[PDB]
Design a protein around this ligand. Structure first.
Ligand SMILES: Cc1cc2nc3c(=O)[nH]c(=O)nc-3n(C[C@H](O)[C@H](O)[C@H](O)COP(=O)(O)OP(=O)(O)OC[C@H]3O[C@@H](n4cnc5c(N)ncnc54)[C@H](O)[C@@H]3O)c2cc1C
Ligand SMILES: Cc1cc2nc3c(=O)[nH]c(=O)nc-3n(C[C@H](O)[C@H](O)[C@H](O)COP(=O)(O)OP(=O)(O)OC[C@H]3O[C@@H](n4cnc5c(N)ncnc54)[C@H](O)[C@@H]3O)c2cc1C
Ligand SMILES: NC(=O)c1ccc[n+]([C@@H]2O[C@H](COP(=O)([O-])OP(=O)(O)OC[C@H]3O[C@@H](n4cnc5c(N)ncnc54)[C@H](O)[C@@H]3O)[C@@H](O)[C@H]2O)c1
Ligand SMILES: NC(=O)c1ccc[n+]([C@@H]2O[C@H](COP(=O)([O-])OP(=O)(O)OC[C@H]3O[C@@H](n4cnc5c(N)ncnc54)[C@H](O)[C@@H]3O)[C@@H](O)[C@H]2O)c1
Lengths: 472, 471
């Protein structure tokens, strides 16, 4: 009972499932293998999707329970949090989307094989089911899209109960009294803010001096931090979490100290979120046998067509270099498969936007001020605060600004950083600008609808271009 | 007795933006305003106050309705404090009006408070309230007077019970039953606001679709369908004969089919006459100055926005082109820029339109009806928000994204969005349009996951390649 295919995709995460569909639509007899009970990988099952849901609901909880709705004439008795119903909405959405992928696979002739896939030959993949079951796939090509897993903190062991990873954090049974987050990367910030909104006393202990992780613009990061602290989210930057141990009483003690020399103190909380990153997952894929050596971070090295050392074996997504993001993985899946079909394969990680779905949102694409400086690029800067943007004022949600970085002489946009409302959606316009190699003048002159948050984007470019915006 | 370079009459979107940009260019600029505040129709009785009410009413609906409960935000009783909801509105308006006072100040623009009139080809006299005057000699005169509510003969607006958009933005009590004459953008938005708050709303429209001119019909039909299931009722292809205020306070509205007959009568507590707006030019001195208006009352201008008289310009709602705030602002800037010597160029095809209901509606470019009428060979790409990850995660999935691409060049000819985030999203489409971008261009641009913008990206992929990934 072996099965034969043109393309066998290992992994059904954002990269894998999008690649499988595209390959099928390009005419390839396609097979997608998944070890988990559902398709969709990290993002859909325990990542982007469930997290954005909690983020959305908790924020609305905040507007109802807090003073915002009251200030609009929406008067409520007692605003109560039903954590179970809130988690249900989250699960309902995750269920629908997983089911959505199952149907798309069927619509596109994608054969779904359930099991742990292992490359057992240059042109063979063997998938082993939990019941010992076996299914062999002879295939012309193999696309590794195995993804990632949470990076473990040596010394602290996660039980997804009181000592959690992002997975456990997304499913807490009740709001924790006091919570501490290790690391102030985007994931830690989002989850941390979700619970903070829901009543939990939260603190994030970061080893670095800013919050938001790698690549975020420093100015944006400090202004973002300021806004988050003014909300109750507390930060202990430039501090290292050395270890943790659970008390006989139930709470957990976290030993910390200054990032360099130690002002070694201790803190206590109800729940501990170990959020120090994710790392590429290639366990028992058979790589060592094929001769495909991993790089230092454990990533599969590939060429411009996403080809591993063995040309008919490719890898994309979280297991290869570049920002570990959902849209990055899907784009690589698509262009890799188009390449297999003979077409051009292009991606510039500089135009891969980043988004923090907190409130205010944070979004950017292109370079940060720091990157331009360490690169020697000469540049100008345009700024426009949302406090001067009409849609934002009318909405009474004026937090933040748009900051545009243009090349000193070419006037070309090099980076866009948005802190405030609508950032997540707005960065996509910026992204389109960078792809076309837009100038600040070009953007400033595109007719933007009034009143819209995008007008801030327009004014910031104009400020960078002409020197002054109009409404500030 | 005072002098200047550029004298602009009107502090509306076109005017205040023009004034500011004129000053930033090195002109001695003076702005003349007849009302108690700056900002024009948009800021005082238009866009701003209505978007505020639309925003607040949607949240009242999500809270009083069932959306919030499905999210674990359980609340015992949810009551509408109409007084405070108007306050929030009023605040926003006040703040933004003062912001223009500060901006005019910051750019050293001279603010004259009075009803201006072109008294001399290089002179403008502003007669204040108390009769006191102020003359202004200038090199250029920029008319940015805007528009006013187009009345309905026979029916007289008292702004109490028979209102216009202005009275509708400040109703003292939620009406029990409300009738809207005209289903253009303004009436649909105002109708939806009161529907959400408690009123039984029915809009009577002469034409066979909602949303005004230029909207794509398929999008219009699906938009009406959604609004109807929200409680918003419509009577399309119906002419409103007349209407009378009865001694019992009630209002009787007479109606027939547009093609005549089918006489009916509708009774309501409030009547909103929303059959459009028209350019405002009363006693400006044009009637005297030699400036002949077109049949619609607009001031004829050339491509640099200047009238018959070369140093007198007109922009915004008082001139041809869509009557939108951003269209008036862009024209103001390019006109003063044109004054200072630069080139002047605007393509009203790239000017977007947004409907701020929920779902929102936004478009830029051409409708399918337009492409068909012009014999264009196009391709259609459609993507429903029901397959969009952010939409589904937010449990707000009405609508779709619709792309029209030219078959030969894959150029995006028109973009149409019915659903969440349309208003912001359309600006990514305006940018694409501006460069003559293709559906494939947009499809290969990396959009953040998960975002609504992805529906736009997928619709383009559908148009370009024939199939989307997620649908
Ligand atoms: C809490 C959280 C929030 C996040 N939020 C965002 C966000 O807002 N935006 C964003 O862009 N990214 C976000 N991410 C990251 C995003 O989820 C990942 O970048 C994305 O899933 C990477 O896609 P991928 O396809 O490469 O891998 P993954 O989706 O991690 O994995 C693909 C699949 O491979 C399967 N697999 C692995 N090995 C085998 C094998 N041998 N046989 C069979 N199947 C196998 C796995 O079980 C998995 O289902 C978030 C992550 C987390 C944890
Ligand atoms: C309820 C409503 C909702 C709307 N929503 C939107 C929307 O969402 N988006 C959008 O783009 N548009 C919207 N509009 C339309 C928008 O308001 C107009 O397109 C815009 O205001 C036109 O700008 P303008 O500067 O030409 O004129 P206006 O802003 O109408 O007027 C400019 C000013 O000129 C003054 N003036 C006139 N004559 C004289 C004189 N002789 N002397 C001194 N001063 C004078 C007026 O008093 C006025 O303040 C809406 C309109 C209404 C009524
Ligand atoms: N070697 C690797 O596997 C490697 C290297 C670099 C980046 N990455 C990955 O790149 C992605 C994005 O990077 P990121 O920086 O935003 O990751 P992230 O968003 O998960 O941030 C985690 C944060 O934890 C902080 N941290 C680690 N140990 C700490 C401690 N003991 N006390 C306090 N803070 C501590 C780090 O400084 C980092 O800012 C992540 O998935 C990350 O794992 C992996
Ligand atoms: O775009 P836009 O400029 O059309 O938006 P708009 O605000 O001008 O739309 C107003 C609507 O009123 C409608 N209308 C005018 N008189 C009417 C009547 N007596 N009965 C029913 N409908 C009537 C017009 O067809 C128009 O669609």
């Amino acid at each position: 009972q072996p099965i034969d295919a043109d393309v066998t995709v290992i992994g059904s995460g954002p990269g894998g499932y999008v690649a499988a569909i595209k390959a099928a639509q390009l005419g390839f007899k396609t097979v997608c293998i998944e070890k988990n009970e559902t398709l969709g990988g990290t993002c859909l099952n325990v990542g982007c999707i469930p997290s954005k849901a909690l983020l959305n609901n908790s924020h609305y909880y905040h507007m109802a329970h807090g003073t915002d709705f009251a200030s609009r004439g929406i008067e409520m008795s007692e605003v109560r949090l039903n954590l179970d119903k809130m988690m249900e909405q989250k699960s309902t959405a995750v269920k629908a989307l997983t089911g959505g992928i199952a149907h798309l696979f069927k619509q596109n002739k994608v054969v779904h094989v359930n099991g742990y896939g292992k490359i057992t030959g240059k042109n063979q993949v063997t998938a082993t089911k939990a019941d010992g079951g076996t299914q062999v796939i002879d295939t012309k090509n193999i696309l590794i899209a195995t993804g990632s897993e949470v990076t473990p903190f040596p010394g602290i062991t996660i039980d997804e109960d009181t000592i959690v990873s992002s997975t456990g954090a997304l499913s807490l049974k009740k709001v924790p009294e006091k919570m501490v987050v290790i690391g102030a990367g985007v994931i830690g910030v989002e989850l941390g803010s979700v619970w903070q909104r829901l009543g939990a006393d939260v603190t994030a202990v970061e080893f670095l001096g800013h919050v938001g992780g790698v690549g975020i613009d420093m100015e944006i990061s400090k202004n973002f931090q300021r806004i988050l602290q003014k909300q109750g989210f507390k930060f202990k930057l430039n501090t290292k979490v050395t270890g943790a141990t659970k008390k006989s009483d139930g709470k957990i003690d976290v030993s910390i100290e200054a990032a360099s020399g130690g002002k070694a103190e201790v803190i206590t909380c109800d729940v501990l979120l170990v959020c120090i990153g994710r790392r590429p997952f290639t366990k028992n894929l058979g790589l060592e046998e094929l001769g495909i050596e991993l790089d230092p971070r454990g990533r599969i090295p590939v060429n411009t067509r996403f080809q591993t050392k063995i040309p008919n074996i490719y890898a994309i997504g979280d297991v290869v270099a570049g920002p570990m993001l959902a849209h990055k993985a899907e784009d690589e899946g698509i262009i890799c498969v188009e390449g297999m079909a003979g077409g051009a394969v292009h991606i510039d990680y500089n135009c891969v936007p980043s988004v923090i779905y907190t409130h205010p949102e944070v979004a950017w694409v292109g370079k940060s001020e720091e990157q331009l400086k360490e690169e020697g690029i000469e540049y100008k800067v345009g700024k426009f605060p949302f406090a001067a943007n009409s849609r934002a004022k009318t909405n009474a949600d004026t937090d933040g600004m748009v900051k545009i970085l243009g090349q000193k002489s070419t006037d070309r946009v090099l980076g866009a950083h948005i802190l405030g409302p609508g950032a997540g959606e707005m960065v996509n316009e910026a992204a389109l600008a960078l792809e076309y190699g837009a100038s600040c003048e070009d953007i400033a002159r595109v007719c933007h609808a009034h009143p819209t948050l995008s007008e801030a984007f327009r004014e910031a470019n104009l400020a960078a271009s002409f020197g002054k915006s109009i409404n500030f």
